[PDB]
């Protein structure tokens, strides 16, 4: 027999990407304050996460197009390896798109906030810069050609 | 002095999420064939990834709204832990949205393809089901209320 499979389009979009963070406030600062992602208030999140968001156990940030970044406070968990440069299978990096005219500002923001740059910035097609978040998860900021 | 920071909206969207996979074909089968994500052909990807995609070292899949899932072949890398149930900081899960009327079909597809369900399906607000990909990275398929 032939197994049933989903058709292209059934999975309509990426609803959210979830990250486990050891230091919730350091991560809220990184994603919300420095990177500028808008945060969802307790009354805007699913009734099932209302108290968790209220208690600061979970935080939700969104891009203007609606994609959600969920942060789950896990103070007792460890990273796969203390050194973020050590690679493994599974999640590699998460990349955000930015207006080509704001790419330089992003690089400057990373610098003024003393965030170490893992790779780049690089210019080509497009431009990109890579850096690690508080837990060692790699983030990429990139833009299309002018 | 006050550090410069990005304003809400600067990071306009999630451009792509990258995963490292030990078995490229097993992952192309999982994401493209079973989950139905549309694949980008070598002529549709950035000139910088043309040969990598051609050689099968990298694969790009997309949701209909444009978000890209990059798969990087890493046959020599290991997962953070062989048992996918072991948790760490950093990436937790990636969730895809599906029409509420197709949620049941998705659950059935997972079953017919003998993919073990980590959690769920659950019904509430919304519905959700969780399962691991070939490398042990957790995927969630969810939908809004009817
Ligand atoms: Co608001
Ligand atoms: Co990338
Ligand atoms: Co096509
Ligand atoms: Co989720």
UniProtKB/TrEMBL annotation, chains A, B:
Tagged with keyword Oxidoreductase: yes
Chain ranges of the VOC domain: 13-144
Keyword Oxidoreductase set for record: yes
Keywords per UniProt: Dioxygenase, Metal-binding, Oxidoreductase
Signal peptide: none
Gene3D superfamilies: 2,3-Dihydroxybiphenyl 1,2-Dioxygenase, domain 1
Domain of life: Bacteria
InterPro entries: Fosfomycin_Res_Enzymes, Glyas_Bleomycin-R_OHBP_Dase, Glyas_Fos-R_dOase_dom, Glyoxalase_1_CS, VOC_core
GO MF assignments: dioxygenase activity; lactoylglutathione lyase activity; metal ion binding
Name of the featured protein: Glyoxalase/bleomycin resistance protein/dioxygenase
Organism expressing this protein natively: Nostoc punctiforme (strain ATCC 29133 / PCC 73102)
């Amino acid at each position: 027999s032939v197994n049933s499979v989903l058709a292209p389009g059934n999975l309509r979009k990426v609803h959210h990407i979830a990250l486990n963070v050891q230091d919730m406030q350091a991560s809220r600062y990184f994603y919300g304050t420095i990177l500028g992602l808008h945060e969802l208030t307790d009354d805007e999140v699913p009734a099932t996460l209302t108290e968790l968001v209220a208690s600061g156990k979970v935080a939700n940030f969104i891009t203007p197009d609606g994609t959600i970044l969920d942060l789950f406070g896990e103070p007792e968990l460890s990273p796969p390896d203390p050194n973020p440069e050590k690679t493994f299978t599974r999640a590699y990096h998460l990349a955000f798109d930015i207006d080509p005219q704001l790419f330089d500002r992003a690089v400057t923001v990373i610098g003024e906030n003393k965030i170490a740059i893992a790779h780049g910035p690089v210019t080509r097609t497009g431009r990109g810069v890579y850096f690690y978040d508080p837990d060692g998860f790699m983030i990429e900021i990139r833009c299309d050609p002018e």
